[model samples]
Target: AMGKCSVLKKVACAAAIAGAVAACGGIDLPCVLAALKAAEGCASCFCEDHCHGVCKDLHLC
Candidate 1:
């Protein structure tokens, strides 16, 4: 459960960062790419469901 908790926290962190990037309008490809990468990393740690939700909300995936 410790590992699961860590993964959940990372997913939350990634989502928060992605939200911040989106708030800036995220017009630059680099910023969008970075957010996408962050989300993907979290997805790998957790599950695709969580990642897809975040990416879809940000219109990045």
Candidate 2:
């Protein structure tokens, strides 16, 4: 949690994630990830589909 990966603002993280995902021909809702950790009702590491990886969770295994 004390890393550069953790210091990024939501927008910055979302922007970077969007770029990488788009470059890798990935499928995910950038907006969802952007809104992920920002919320309180969905902050469980072992959890899924709280909007962070919801898109991937829907399509991935």
Candidate 3:
């Protein structure tokens, strides 16, 4: 069940990040990751529903 464990961890990580972001109010809600072309999209990572800020803030193109 390694796959399940990994999936569970990702879900937990997303929830924590989302909560932190919501409380801090630094990054935009559901950040637009159109700029981070090289990096994987939120849908492919843990930040699917609530995209992270760092990737969006920097061009990283």
Tell me the TM-score of each prediction against the true structure.
Answer: 0.27, 0.29, 0.31
TM-score of 3: 0.31
What is the model-wide C-alpha lDDT for candidate 1?
Answer: 0.44
- Against the reference, the lDDT scores of all candidates come to 0.44, 0.37, 0.38
Model 2 C-alpha lDDT per residue in residues 16-57, reported as the tens digit of each score: 444534544553344333434343222222123233446355
Kindly list the per-residue Cα lDDT of model 1 for residues 1-61, writing each as its tens digit: 1222265576574464456457567433345545545554433333333345554554433
Specify the poorest-scoring 10-residue window by lDDT in model 3.
34-43
Considering every candidate listed, which one attains the maximal lDDT? 1
Cα deviation at 31, candidate 2, in Å, is 19
Query: Per-residue lDDT for 46 in model 2?
Result: 12
Better of 1 and 3 by TM-score: 3
Report how far residue 2 has shifted in candidate 3, in Å: 14
Candidates sorted by lDDT, descending order?
1, 3, 2
What's model 1's TM-score?
Answer: 0.27
lDDT of 1 at 30: 40
